[PDB]
From TrEMBL, chains A, B, C, D:
The lineage of its organism: Bacteria, Pseudomonadati, Pseudomonadota, Gammaproteobacteria, Pseudomonadales. This is Fucose-binding lectin. It comes from the Bacteria. Residues 6-113 form the Calcium-mediated lectin domain. GO terms for molecular function: carbohydrate binding. SUPFAM superfamilies: Calcium-mediated lectin. Pfam families: PA-IIL. InterPro entries: Ca-mediated_lectin (IPR010907), Ca_lectin_sf (IPR036684), Lectin_sugar-bd (IPR016927). The keyword 4Fe-4S does not apply. The keyword ATP-binding does not apply. Keywords: Lectin.
Length: 114, 114, 114, 114
DNA sequence: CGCATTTATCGC
DNA sequence: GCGATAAATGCG
DNA sequence: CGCATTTATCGC
DNA sequence: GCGATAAATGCG
DNA sequence: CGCATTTATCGC
DNA sequence: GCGATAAATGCG
DNA sequence: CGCATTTATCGC
DNA sequence: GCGATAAATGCG
């Protein structure tokens, strides 16, 4: 199924964060309404932050995360969690290799902010 | 109920990350087996990373997250999510004020690494 | 923090389901906009369904779940999960005793329907 | 990625529940260690329970859920959630059609029991 | 015509 | 913890 | 004034 | 897999 | 050799 | 809320 | 006595 | 994508 696509409230400030756990060079791309809004690129095998950002839903709220590595797009896993019906997490994993750990690029979206 | 306490596999490398969304000065404390293992302190209202870290479960796996602010401990919300039965997230929110947004200190644990 | 309270889209059909895992007699109560909409009562220690139902968000969407047992309200744990940004789960646990398993009354809300 | 596969503690009692939200006739199949352990079959478009069951992890814990409809296997979405580090949910959605609601067969595993 | 007027939410 | 902000009728 | 008119979503 | 449904101007 | 002996967890 | 249950040395 | 010996997992 | 790693009997 379609992974890494989330609908958050229209025109809402949120935070994006990505980590790396692979020898491959992660090209994390964050779209908003099918528009590129941010691009993190880095390499790590020790869960290093390759990018943080504050963005805006726009006035759809269609945030999507794509993860390419060296050109080859990765396969994605995603979910959204809400605590106390206020604090939201949007979680994205990704696999570039074959050992199925899906941590090569870990993306964490969260909102509300402030 | 008890929040911010997680049991991850014995002796396993994981990553801890904290953000701030409050005028209050977040004192994030990360215990392992009731031992302090890491202490992040910072202030932000723009979801800034106040700390990243690679730690070890030890040989219980009892990771706990506590969040004090200016002395006053915050109330916590927590959950653990697993994708494709391999990639784990342990999420912690916290409230220091009264507006119940619970984003003042957002803590994100993830594993496996590498 | 406040548990067992969820905001789902205005005027939306969803399903409620409750289970029992305690010698105590679970009085599961499902409010909508602070109005009682359904009341399941039963007893089991073998995860028996004590009630299923199709309800409507109304035109707020404030669905709340309360769990009393023999009069004494239980302490609640809750979260909401979304898969493929379409299929929603709202999960509620509850504790009437002291052994902290929180399965005495397990409540599962899901939507969309059809 | 691989969906509908969960690893729960060895030799542990849990509950399986399935719902239906499609004109298609859902053949929910629940394997344990790649052994069929339970088979629910039913039809509904009003979120009807097509099966409940108490099973055992066995001594691997590899519980898998497969969903065929009229022969054609469905595409799956899955996740596991844990509250207060005690109460576990394993959630499975599935799509037999093309409208991508993924509620046609909703499967809910939960543990511990008692 | 467009543009000010009239307590829950967002932003530093 | 604070203050600035924003479907109908009236008006420039 | 209220009430029909004009492709994405919900319901059996 | 199918069909019925629903911010502005026009009208009864 | 196999089989009883010696406080956290599971089952009705 | 209750009680029955289960890595080493000793033994039948 | 302790210490090497004998394909799924973790670490850079 | 790679290689180093780790319940019983044997032995120093
Ligand atoms: O696909 P191949 O060139 O390899 C890379 C594997 C990659 O890095 C290693 C360290 C591991 O973490 C794996 O999960 C990644 O996919
Ligand atoms: O409790 P009081 O001194 O205030 C602080 C509120 C705090 O900061 C603001 C910006 C808001 O984000 C709120 O959520 C925090 O609790
Ligand atoms: O609080 P006390 O009268 O007891 C009841 C415990 C109750 O039932 C048992 C079976 C157990 O499952 C526990 O979790 C429940 O709280
Ligand atoms: O695939 P086609 O024969 O159709 C069936 C659609 C099916 O039922 C309807 C009611 C809807 O709920 C859809 O989600 C299901 O896939
Ligand atoms: Ca990988
Ligand atoms: Ca990896
Ligand atoms: Ca706050
Ligand atoms: Ca805040
Ligand atoms: Ca209990
Ligand atoms: Ca119980
Ligand atoms: Ca469908
Ligand atoms: Ca359906
Ligand atoms: Na006033
Ligand atoms: Na037409
Ligand atoms: Na004794
Ligand atoms: Na060999």
């Amino acid at each position: 199924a379609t992974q890494g696509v989330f609908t958050l409230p229209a025109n809402t400030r949120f935070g994006v964060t990505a980590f790396a756990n692979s020898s491959g060079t992660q090209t994390v791309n964050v779209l908003v309404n099918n528009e590129t809004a941010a691009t993190f690129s880095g390499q790590s095998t020790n869960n290093a932050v390759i990018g943080t950002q504050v963005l805006n839903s726009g006035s759809s709220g269609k945030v999507q995360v794509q993860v390419s590595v060296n050109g080859r797009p990765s396969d994605l896993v995603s979910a959204q969690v809400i605590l106390t019906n206020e604090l939201n997490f949007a979680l994205v994993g990704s696999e570039d290799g074959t050992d199925n750990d899906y941590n090569d690029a870990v993306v964490v979206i969260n909102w509300p902010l402030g």
